[PDB]
Homo-oligomer: A and B are copies of this chain.
Amino acid sequence: SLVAELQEKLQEEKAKFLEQLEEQEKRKNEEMQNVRTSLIAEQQTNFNTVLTREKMRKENIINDLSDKLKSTMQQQERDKDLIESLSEDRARLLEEKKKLEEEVSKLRSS
């Protein structure tokens, strides 16, 4: 029966059409994910070039300021070591000079 055969081929083609729609929904979603992933990767690469370019636009001033500040701070630490020693040693010399002046005075009037 040809009627039979076409009744069956109708139902099998309807089912097949349904599954090609579903299979095509899935490939399109996989293509979008693929495109999305590719865009993210290529932008994020380009951002990197831009940031590195921008890192250097002020590198020469930071490196200048940094090395002046290192050297005037090293000179400040020497000066603070010197000032603390000179200040303390003078104070001792002052006391020692006063007690020597008293010793001289007493010996002169002995």
Contact = CB atoms under 8 A, between A and B. Distances in A.
Interface string A1-20: 01100110110011001001
A85 to B, nearest CB: 9
Contact of A69 (B36, B55, B69): B69
Interface string A26-54: 00100110011001100100110011001
Interface string A59-89: 0011001101100110110011011001101
Contacts of A86: 83, 86-87, 90
Given A31-B32, A93-B97, A100-B100, 4 more contacts: A51-B54, A61-B62, A68-B73, A72-B73
